[PDB]
Amino acid sequence: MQLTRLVQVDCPLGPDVLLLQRMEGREELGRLFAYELHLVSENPNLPLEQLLGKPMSLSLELPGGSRRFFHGIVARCSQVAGHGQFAGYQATLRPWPWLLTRTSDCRIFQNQSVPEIIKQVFRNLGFSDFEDALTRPYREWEYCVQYRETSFDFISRLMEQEGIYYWFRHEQKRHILVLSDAYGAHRSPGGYASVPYYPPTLGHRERDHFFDWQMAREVQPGSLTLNDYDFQRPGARLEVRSNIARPHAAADYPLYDYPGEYVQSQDGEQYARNRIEAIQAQHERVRLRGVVRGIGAGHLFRLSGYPRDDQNREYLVVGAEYRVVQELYETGSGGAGSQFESELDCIDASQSFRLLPQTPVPVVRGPQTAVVVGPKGEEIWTDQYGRVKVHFHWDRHDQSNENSSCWIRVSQAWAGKNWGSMQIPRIGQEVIVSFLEGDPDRPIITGRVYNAEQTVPYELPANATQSGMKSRSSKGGTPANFNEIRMEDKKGAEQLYIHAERNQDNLVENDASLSVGHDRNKSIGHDELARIGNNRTRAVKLNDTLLVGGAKSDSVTGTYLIEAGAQIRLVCGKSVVEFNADGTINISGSAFNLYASGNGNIDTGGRLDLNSGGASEVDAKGKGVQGTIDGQVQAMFPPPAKGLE
Amino acid sequence: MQLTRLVQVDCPLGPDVLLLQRMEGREELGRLFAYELHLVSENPNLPLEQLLGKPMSLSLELPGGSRRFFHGIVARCSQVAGHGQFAGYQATLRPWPWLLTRTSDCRIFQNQSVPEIIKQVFRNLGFSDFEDALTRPYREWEYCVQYRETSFDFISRLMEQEGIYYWFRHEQKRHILVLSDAYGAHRSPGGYASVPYYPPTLGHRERDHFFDWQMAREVQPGSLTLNDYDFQRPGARLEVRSNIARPHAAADYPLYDYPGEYVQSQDGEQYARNRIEAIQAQHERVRLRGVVRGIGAGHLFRLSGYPRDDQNREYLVVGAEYRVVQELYETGSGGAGSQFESELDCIDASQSFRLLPQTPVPVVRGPQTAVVVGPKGEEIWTDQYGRVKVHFHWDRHDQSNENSSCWIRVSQAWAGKNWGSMQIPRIGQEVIVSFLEGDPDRPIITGRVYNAEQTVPYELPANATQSGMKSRSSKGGTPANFNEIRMEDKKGAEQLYIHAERNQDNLVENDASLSVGHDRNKSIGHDELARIGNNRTRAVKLNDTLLVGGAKSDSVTGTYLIEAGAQIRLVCGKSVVEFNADGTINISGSAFNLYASGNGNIDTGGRLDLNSGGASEVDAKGKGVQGTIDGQVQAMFPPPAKGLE
Amino acid sequence: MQLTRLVQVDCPLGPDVLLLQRMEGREELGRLFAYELHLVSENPNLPLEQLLGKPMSLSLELPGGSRRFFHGIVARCSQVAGHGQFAGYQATLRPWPWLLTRTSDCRIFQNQSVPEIIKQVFRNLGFSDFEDALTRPYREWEYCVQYRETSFDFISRLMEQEGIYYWFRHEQKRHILVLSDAYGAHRSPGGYASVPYYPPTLGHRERDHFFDWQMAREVQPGSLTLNDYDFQRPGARLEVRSNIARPHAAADYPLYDYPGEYVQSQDGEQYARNRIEAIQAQHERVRLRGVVRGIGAGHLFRLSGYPRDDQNREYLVVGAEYRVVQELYETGSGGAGSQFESELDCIDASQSFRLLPQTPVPVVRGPQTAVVVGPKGEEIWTDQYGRVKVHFHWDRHDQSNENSSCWIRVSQAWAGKNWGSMQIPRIGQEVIVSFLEGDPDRPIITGRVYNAEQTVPYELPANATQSGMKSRSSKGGTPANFNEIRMEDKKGAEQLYIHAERNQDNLVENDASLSVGHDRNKSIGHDELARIGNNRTRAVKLNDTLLVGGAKSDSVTGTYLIEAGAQIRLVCGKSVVEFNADGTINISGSAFNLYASGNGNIDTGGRLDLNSGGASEVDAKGKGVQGTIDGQVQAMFPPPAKGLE
Numbered sequence A, B, C: 001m002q003l004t005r006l007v008q009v010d011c012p013l014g015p016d017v018l019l020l021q022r023m024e025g026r027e028e029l030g031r032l033f034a035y036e037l038h039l040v041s042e043n044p045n046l047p048l049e050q051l052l053g054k055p056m057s058l059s060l061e062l063p064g065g066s067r068r069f070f071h072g073i074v075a076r077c078s079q080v081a082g083h084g085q086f087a088g089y090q091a092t093l094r095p096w097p098w099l100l101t102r103t104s105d106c107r108i109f110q111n112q113s114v115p116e117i118i119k120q121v122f123r124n125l126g127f128s129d130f131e132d133a134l135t136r137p138y139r140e141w142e143y144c145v146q147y148r149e150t151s152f153d154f155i156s157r158l159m160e161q162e163g164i165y166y167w168f169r170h171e172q173k174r175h176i177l178v179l180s181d182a183y184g185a186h187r188s189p190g191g192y193a194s195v196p197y198y199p200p201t202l203g204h205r206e207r208d209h210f211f212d213w214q215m216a217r218e219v220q221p222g223s224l225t226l227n228d229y230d231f232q233r234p235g236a237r238l239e240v241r242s243n244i245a246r247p248h249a250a251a252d253y254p255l256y257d258y259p260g261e262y263v264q265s266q267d268g269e270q271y272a273r274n275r276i277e278a279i280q281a282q283h284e285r286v287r288l289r290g291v292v293r294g295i296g297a298g299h300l301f302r303l304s305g306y307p308r309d310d311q312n313r314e315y316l317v318v319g320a321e322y323r324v325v326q327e328l329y330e331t332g333s334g335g336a337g338s339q340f341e342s343e344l345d346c347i348d349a350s351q352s353f354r355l356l357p358q359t360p361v362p363v364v365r366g367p368q369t370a371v372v373v374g375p376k377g378e379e380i381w382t383d384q385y386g387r388v389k390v391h392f393h394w395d396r397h398d399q400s401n402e403n404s405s406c407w408i409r410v411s412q413a414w415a416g417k418n419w420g421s422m423q424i425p426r427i428g429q430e431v432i433v434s435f436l437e438g439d440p441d442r443p444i445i446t447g448r449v450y451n452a453e454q455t456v457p458y459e460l461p462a463n464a465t466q467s468g469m470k471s472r473s474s475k476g477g478t479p480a481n482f483n484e485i486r487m488e489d490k491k492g493a494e495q496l497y498i499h500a501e502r503n504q505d506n507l508v509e510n511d512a513s514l515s516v517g518h519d520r521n522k523s524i525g526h527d528e529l530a531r532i533g534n535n536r537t538r539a540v541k542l543n544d545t546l547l548v549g550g551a552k553s554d555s556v557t558g559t560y561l562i563e564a565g566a567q568i569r570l571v572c573g574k575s576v577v578e579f580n581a582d583g584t585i586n587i588s589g590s591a592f593n594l595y596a597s598g599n600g601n602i603d604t605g606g607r608l609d610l611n612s613g614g615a616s617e618v619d620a621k622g623k624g625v626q627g628t629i630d631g632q633v634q635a636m637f638p639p640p641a642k643g644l645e
């Protein structure tokens, strides 16, 4: 209210009575300021329930001109027990981004740009009151991650990567964060555009102006060429360069970094461009002092007092540092501007501003594990390059699903040009994830692991000596639908076990050579057809045995030679024929029929005639009958399957 | 001894003569102090053999009260050649933990708590003279590692992780390190419990008290929730939170970190609790100045001079900073307390103390290798989750064995719910070990490697084109007991070789389809039994050959049809039967017998009669005899095995 | 030129007129100096095209003695607008290595030593004007990498690892960088070798000398033992120690680090030696002040004024810090040495100098990928330990080939003593490379990956459910010369497919047991020979069928028993024999011949006689003829192969 006169402070509560003596306000464009206010006043006790966590309003004035009325947060404050004759305080102010320093997350941003990624940490826990004075387009980040760090640390490092900076466009209603870059972004007052300069010849003057200049210049790197890798296009022209030479000795000495974190070429030519431009602020920076109360970090002006036709040009004030000083009364009615002071760091226009990086790159010093993800009913979610998708064990955003990550590559055992090893991670099983050069924005899947839900395949903690690979039917995980190859290396009990869950189809292009040292037992269920082109040879050192349980059937287009070295019997019920190596043919039946279309000869070298001689019976020796054969076949697999109870 | 009067210093050698003027002693609870002593004295030369590496004794006095007689180590000292009129020195003191700064290890601690882990680096190279004033229980660490770092750096970071701090309980006999936490741990003198406060109205007073207060306060993070991963229980409620709000604006803004390094839940609720509590020291800290010689870092007191009913409460002095000043003689007989000075940082009780972390977390910036271990006679030491145990190549503690590590997980190629790849590392062979997020307390096994003792399986540095897997018999490593699958990819000489060290058991659930393009040679040693359920079909385009070396035996329950398209001979020594497609049956023997139980018919379409006609002999064409057959069988494998000499 | 008198500065342009007042020159042996020159002069505008990037020449003089005429680079310079009454400037000088600070590379050095590795970054972008005063030999580095960092940062960290340091041997022609170590490397003037010392009793003297001493000493670590791993010799005595004790309390307290980055033993005993020696500079350092204008960092001298027989010995000045001061005219004709000042840090000889390390070790915080390399025509380049060679995606040095790297080990899935897994990376396919403990000089290959040129083997992005391994013919990558094992896990359509690109050779040591649940179809191209030692048993539950397309041939040394349970026919064109289980033998032909060498009997139990009875024809039932059999064989694989158009 309180127009007696003199001191008028509010927004959130500020007494008009409470006087101010000193301040000390540093800042840099793209950094926080701090205003070292030392107060003194009447009040003994005021609360802490807001004022420590909420604004103050300051009012710096160039009357008849660009008032600078201020409004910003209190973040550290104190009182002082030196004088019980009147209060004394301290009060350092810092802007609203500071209140994103004392905070911390682990959060993933996807398919967003790195201006409007920063809008959300603002908006979700804050206002819309910031502004946009950007002009070119930047990169729309596929996958950006605020890793472990503080939201304030997060936003600024990204702004620094992209050349965005900021300042506070000072407003009489609502405070403002100016998201900016380049000439056509900043702005300044009228008639004020050109500010004075004068050596105050009698020590001091009744006037506001400049009384100091210094132009410091260091040598700066000449060119920062960049390079990255691109597996999408593993042949492409990866290199990118930037160059801003000004004409002098020992200038164009080059820099070079690998991972500049780019995918597409032109974007890497921007990044080299932004980081090259920041370092060239240092090339030429200028140092001033004046008693003028209009300018501050971010402001543009033009100097006219220390002249050169085009030395003193446009000037963006980067870091204004200033002071207030007074021990003022209502005495000597009047009293005017009790002394002030300022100091300055400026630049130009065709020579433009960028921010120097200075922050640890979120320090992911080793691998994590993650669940390879997709909720129920699913088992396989890959892509064309054998990529999968994961949730890291830090997600308060979904029941991890196809949105938990970008696609992540897998590190196979053996991988070549459309040939080599492949086992893609199923959904729900855990992996090892590394990070290329340790960047939390660049996962890569580098191995698998077993846990309590995803348990080892075999008998553990027991047959450690077994090894192999066993798969699982997909869509349907029944604890035994699987193809497996398993080598067991336990002495005396070694084995190689191959299990085809359905069908097996072995193809050998030239020759094959099965050698078994003891026995083979082959048992096929329904049918075998074996076919061999040219010749089939079968040699058995001892007894060859064959039981047919149906009709046996043998066709030979030419000749079938049946040779014995002892004896040949064909026994067929009551009709038994027997050929012997001594040469005695024996035949028994129950009748016989002998027919020749043409002729028949029966001859000897002894006697023949007819009747009496051939045995009364040459018996079939028991076996002959069909029932007997049955069981020599059927003594097979008619097995039990009792049933449980 | 030397009671003239005035200055009385000893333990390790201190002259009574040698006067002291200045000191400057800073400390913080949980940090080292340093006392900037500038001496002057008689002596020109005294040695360096101890005094630089050993104590001094100081004596600060509040006579008629709490004397503070001191005893601590010298760690940096100097003399000064300004005056040959009397000596001048410097002497900065620091406590005994400093003498664990200039040291360094790489050592593993197992199944120990993180109070009494610190007891050993103390005790093994030092004393038992420290104390314990702790009250709650902390975590008993399964696996804790002092990685590369200094013993002083090791102990303090752990104390900082667990909320333990310290101070020195000042003793007239033997110096003391107070391992502490919470109210019921600290302590203080009597009647001294309440110390004075007075603005020394005539500049100065004949009295000891306080003459300054300042209560600085910053805004602090509102809550640090934590989260970790737990593969033992990969479904569990990992999250843990902590909260200490005091009522003000912009307060309850949260923090969040992942790996807080916890296994079990409650312990993570402590860690969030300890780290949240440290940051809330900064919330409210108080700054004092007095001329009183009783208090120091760690001391508790209660102020009474600057009052508020409950503003000035209990006060644990966190960091006392103080001064001595004198140029004193035995003149103006008397002379009293030549001036002193102190400064202070205090806290309360229901608002309790914790340490701010500030030390690099032992910087394991990449993987190591390690030997997977167990001394002789052993080959396989795993557990239920397919874990093994390693020694890292830095052990001066055992011939590495089952105690070298905690169990470490392995990174398989393919791992799923009781299905997937397994090859567990044998004892003696080397691996690659990564560290989760780069923490030296969290190894994980991530790959294998060959070395000079553990050599590549094949012909190296030669058949680079071969690949595969070969196992080894376990318990018995004979350079050829093994199951192997080996693909060789050299053009013209390609091969797939499968080797079963004992037994092979292939199971196909539906169908199988072996196609070989050239030849197969199958040779079984002892027996084959092949059985097919339904039908067996065998078709050969050209000559089918069979040699039996024993008894051939063929049974068919129904019909055996034997069909030829040219000719059928059965030759049996001197009895040869020959059926021909034109229809001429030829039979030769040495006798024949023909019998029919019932009837016999012999018919023609030409003539028959008896005798003269059938050949004198239709010869067996040489082959018939048993000796011949032998060699057609036996021309097999009766091989040599000469013998070596 | 300009001998009026007084001030004589040049090389690159320096006016004789332009006066100098202050300087402030700090340095440390093994670091850059900086000379804080504040100028004042006539000139308003001089250019910037060289002078900022090029030298100045200073001339410090001890007339009648060791002149110190200087010549060094300007790197940051400024002017000042305070006085338009005469100019004012600043000008900080720094040596020529500074101009390797504002630069950056990622470059590999191979089979070179770490003195003459530094020669090239010098020589390729600079002069030969440096010098060599080294005496012992150092390590010839197999593989050294300047990773990301600045050339100045690169050279100094390596010099610090090896104990080399430097200073500038000040020359009247051409400036000099002294690459040095040990006593016999430094040097100094004559008669000057011993410099004075005097307390300037009337405040000041007409003379140059010392007027201050201080000998500061801290306690230092007692011994730094080292240890590394050596897979070449995985059993060897890795440990190495160093020790320099001087006699005092709390001294011999040890250090220990693992990776000291050594291969061979003695070299690690040097590294422990160099790093132990640096820390023992701090053990004893000495602080001086004089008005003498001959000495500077690197200079050796001997003090004689503050005596002790052997306290004041040889003195290598490590860091001289000095000053100039004057506001001089040509007035009071004469005027002499307008005042100067210096300050000092010295050491000795038998106690020798080394550099303290202080630089981030190039921070490779995670893995890269790389192409495993060798240009066209090649597919496999390995060594004896299964190592390959890579180019990292940052090479501007070759079309990456056998010189791109040192040999790098691969991380197999399973690796043991001449047994275990092997798939060595082919040339052109990409890998994952980690770095042991994150050192850019120690790659290790830790996994594979697919990209756009090196594509997945199968149907992607489709049969994700298939897995396996497929190789490729080497020397000849035809998109189907390969051995493959492939498990397909899709329900109802599961399969195990084995493909041998040429030959397959399965060996089973004891038994084998093929069980197929449905059918087997085996088709061999040319020949099969099957042989079984003892007994072959074949049982078929239903119909056994055999078609021979050539000559069938069966030999049995003993007996062939042919048994039927229904009937046996042998049909051979027009001659059909039929034996039946009731006992009726039926024979039909077109003639028959029956012969017995000895006797013949034909008998019955009914009637016989001759003629009338046996059938007019028992027909062959159609099948008998050879054409029919043909197609029962030949209905096989006479397939089409139409042709494309």
Ligand SMILES: [Cl-]
Binding pocket: none
């Ligand atoms: Cl009034």
Ligand SMILES: [Cl-]
Binding pocket: A013, A014, A015
């Ligand atoms: Cl108010």
Ligand SMILES: [Cl-]
Binding pocket: none
């Ligand atoms: Cl600054």
Ligand SMILES: [Cl-]
Binding pocket: A041, A042, A043, A086, A087
């Ligand atoms: Cl008041």
Ligand SMILES: [Cl-]
Binding pocket: A054, A055
């Ligand atoms: Cl607000």
Ligand SMILES: [Cl-]
Binding pocket: none
């Ligand atoms: Cl879109």
Ligand SMILES: [Cl-]
Binding pocket: A120
């Ligand atoms: Cl969000």
Ligand SMILES: [Cl-]
Binding pocket: A137, A138, A139, A266, A267
């Ligand atoms: Cl763009």
Ligand SMILES: [Cl-]
Binding pocket: A127, A129, A174, A175
């Ligand atoms: Cl607003």
Ligand SMILES: [Cl-]
Binding pocket: A173, A174
């Ligand atoms: Cl507005």
Ligand SMILES: [Cl-]
Binding pocket: none
């Ligand atoms: Cl091009």
Ligand SMILES: [Cl-]
Binding pocket: A243, A244
């Ligand atoms: Cl340009």
Ligand SMILES: [Cl-]
Binding pocket: A259, A261, A436, A437, A439, A442
């Ligand atoms: Cl990166």
Ligand SMILES: [Cl-]
Binding pocket: A236, A263, A264, A265, A266
């Ligand atoms: Cl591109």
Ligand SMILES: [Cl-]
Binding pocket: none
């Ligand atoms: Cl542009």
Ligand SMILES: [Cl-]
Binding pocket: A330, A331, A332, A333
């Ligand atoms: Cl008045």
